[PDB]
Amino acid sequence: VGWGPNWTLVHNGDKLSERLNAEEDRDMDTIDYGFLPKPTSAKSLTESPFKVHVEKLSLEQKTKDLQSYLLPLEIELKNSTVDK
Amino acid sequence: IPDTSRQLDCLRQLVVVLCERSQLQDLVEFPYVNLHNEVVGIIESRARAVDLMTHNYYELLYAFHIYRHNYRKAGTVMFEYGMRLGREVRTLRGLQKQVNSYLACLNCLRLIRPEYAWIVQPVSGAVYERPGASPKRNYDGESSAVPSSSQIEILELRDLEKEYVLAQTRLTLAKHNPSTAAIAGSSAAEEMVALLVQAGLFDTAISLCQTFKLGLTSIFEGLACKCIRLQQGGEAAQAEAWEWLAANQLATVITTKESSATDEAWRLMISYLDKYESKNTLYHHCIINKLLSHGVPLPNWLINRYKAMDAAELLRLYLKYDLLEEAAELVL
Amino acid sequence: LFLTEAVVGSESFCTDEFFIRRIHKLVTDFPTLMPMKVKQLRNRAEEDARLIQMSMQMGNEPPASLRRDLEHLLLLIGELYRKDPFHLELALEYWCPTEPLQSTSLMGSFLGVAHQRPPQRQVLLSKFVRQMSDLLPATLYLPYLKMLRGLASGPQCAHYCFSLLKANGGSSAENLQAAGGSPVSWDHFFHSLMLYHEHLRRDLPNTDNIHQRHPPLRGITQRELDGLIACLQLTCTIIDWSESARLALCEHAQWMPVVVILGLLQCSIPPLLKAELLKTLAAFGKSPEIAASLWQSLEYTQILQTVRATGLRQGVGIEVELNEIESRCEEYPLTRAFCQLISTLVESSFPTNLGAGLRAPGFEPY
Amino acid sequence: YSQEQFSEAASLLLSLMTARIAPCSFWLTLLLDALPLLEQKQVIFSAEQTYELMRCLEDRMAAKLESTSPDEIQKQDSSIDNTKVEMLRLALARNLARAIVTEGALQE
Amino acid sequence: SHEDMIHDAQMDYYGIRLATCSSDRSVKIFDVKNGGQILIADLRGHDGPVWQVAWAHPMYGNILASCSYDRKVIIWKEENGTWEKTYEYTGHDSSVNSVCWAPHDFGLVLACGSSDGAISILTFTGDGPWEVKKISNAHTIGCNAVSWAPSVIPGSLVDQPSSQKPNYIKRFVSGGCDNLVKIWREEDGQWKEDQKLEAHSDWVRDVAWAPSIGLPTSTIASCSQDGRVYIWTSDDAATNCWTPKLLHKFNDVVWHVSWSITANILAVSGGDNKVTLWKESVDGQWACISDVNK
Amino acid sequence: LIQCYSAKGRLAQSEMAKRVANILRVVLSLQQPP
Asked: Rounded to an integer, what distance in angstroms lies between the CA atom of residue B248 and that of residue B207?
């Protein structure tokens, strides 16, 4: 896999990214279809993944932590002193 | 005459009466020191006033510059005349005049050091044709003004050669088909290349592609289609292809109607690859890809050449195109 | 409108070339005898278009004024050539000879001599066309394309129309708008296609949409529908009556419309647009090389679920479309479009190798 | 050329340039064979004829430069060939100026 | 893409440009925007398969020194958004391994890890020639992996503000098939040993130093054939001391032990078909909190 | 020498020389009685 800003794993090979309830044959519709009729009659007897995709893998999955991360630092800014 | 305005008026009257009596050699042979710029301006004003049927004021300016040793001025005048002819008419005559002007400008630029290889935009101005009714008498064109010097962009020798190549390609298209002059006057480089390929002017097509730095995928597809048609055709198709390919390659082996055009096309591809690049294999890649898309493996001499070159690329391409037996034998 | 409907409803004007000659003489003599009337009608149409625009902008209903006489005459002159079975090419006499379309091969002779003057009537018509190209009324955005389609019939007429389109296109400002710009422009058509692709991506940023969040304008506005149908039919007529124009518009270096049309055919689009794109692709593949390229692209993209070794039979695609929307609309043009497309493709290029390099030749599923 | 006929000389030159005979070693001499027909000033010369002649000569020299090598030249005659090309262009300019003078003086 | 044999792709410093060294005798370059990706560049000129290409620095210039098979390395140059060849270095018998660059204040020196039984160092100023030096007589077999030291002096030591100047002295480590691990240091032309260790009982496969961008902590992660993953961490002051700390008793041959952009997170890739991010918690030692595919 | 690094540099140098000559002749005509 690749690398990024410290704890930021990008895509490069095979990894376990973010999961989403949208696989084939599930509850309440949600289906898909792959490249099934592509190899017909004569073909190359070799299976391999095709194409690529650039996705992200995170672990926070929270949008309300901004206040919890800013308010303590907001109060620390008052007690902080510049040293120069 | 001491008065400058009266001198200019007298020069204008002299130009008028000389163009009326058809006596241009007098003004050509008459030298003009210091007042050369005034004479040039007077002739330019006369050319902007009248049309181009009464002699050629721009050719007279070119002759005067040649007599007074002004190669850059002569080249700029020739380029302006060519641009005006192109804006007036886009037909075969206009294309020929533009080609002549481009060639004269290139010669004038090469006659001097490369430090003057770039020229600025010519002097603007319109040529009012036929004073009386309509100021613009264009049978196949719009207006008659050269590109103004607002966008300061000096035209390099590369751009001049590109314009000359485009004009000569338009002229060749018009010669190969009279009903395509006005079409090529506004067509695109890709359409020009496709027309040259479908006609048989592969030399000019390759020259245009090398000058434009474009791609050769369409040319390779056309060549593969022609090879397939020659392989699946008969003696009539062979003769029809010879009638257009008899003047393209260097006839090293004596040509005859016995052998088909397969070896001729092979030697043509060899010569084209040697003239292009002896190391780049993208041309061979596209050729064999189009051949496999048509439905026939690459010839034995292509096989031998690319085997003496590489091998893993052949194995990968065979595994991708489902040539399992050939790939297995080759890797063994 | 009355005379246009009465002529269309009858088939008596189809025969006798003298009738066509007389109506052409009438059409050519109307503006020569009505000088300031044409300018007055143009000003009234512009005022009505501005009023309709301001009404639809402020929320009020668009006023239906009786100043559409120009559009009615244009509809008449466009339907006349479309219903006339003869082939006299009235566009050659209607347009100005100053457009880039000559057959020269000499120096200063044979349609190559300079310092010439076109006919005064044709010069005035070209000047009127150039004046109407700028500040186009919003109420005539569709009749212009309709009449362009009607006049594009014929080889030389289509060549003249392509020359006019090439002269109109380029770096312009009053040729890329709708309520104040002319739709006849390569850049205008390209920006329209880009806007429609952006609307489709806003609906769903993936191929084959499964749900529409909001109804776009193209589908609920009849003006956009008429404009798209008119432009597509005009392009189809151009590429059917001419080959150089087709090659020029297919080998564009600015943008590639082939991939856009392929994606639109892969995705869900109304059946009228589907049939229009199918016949446009057929007229494109009328040439052998274009036919081979289109056949390769079709074999690689798989519109019909071709099953020879594996693949879902009767899956989502042309079959589902013709069983759903065609059956709902009780009209089946898609079947005829697909049939004529595959017929032309087989006629122009035999399937010597099906697919790219991972298939085998076989017409068994078809 | 010994019997003196510049019109026939130009005609034969155009015919040879359109026929393309012999390889490059003789194409060089065929392209050089033009100065004796260009340094002259007598004999009636047509402006359009001189224009088409110089256009054909420039097209032939461009085709020769393109066929020798892609955007370069070979052999050992480089500076001499460039000087010959320059002097031929100068003679051609003088000849076309004389032709323009003659065309302007004929219509008197 | 996935149909080829991609070793390890690279990303631009900004994070919008991606480069894959595919096995198609070429290097592809995509521009990732919004969602989908678009292939823009296709650099052709690498004989055989391409190992990996390391990035340079934005303040010094974009340089992507590619290393491929057939014993050759190609240094390119970018202008007006277009890349073109500008230097080619060949002339080796054994297959060259991988190449790496230098950090910020350390400079811009390219280390050519050749398995010819010697070391080849290519120093480049910025727009001139390339100084190629060869330190011969290494040991029996050629080297395998090479790594550099941080820009400052080796040894994690707290310095005073406005009192530390990063010198231009060079310090590097080279690990090959010799059952040992060494470290060389030079004063701009005087390579010499520093310390010696005898703890590895098998053939050392690879080594990787972690120049932390934030602290001068020197830690080298090594991997062999059996699976002895020793974390040689030096946290003293200015001397040299390595402690053999067995991370995990592996049973494979790990070939890659990459470090994050801050040299704090370690990504292991070898013969385990998985990647376990054994991050360093806030109390030393190790902790496995994430495991993904290879 | 000023600029003269490429075609644009040589063009700028020529323009600067022309402007210098024009300014010189203008200031000469101004210093001289008109």
From this structure: 13
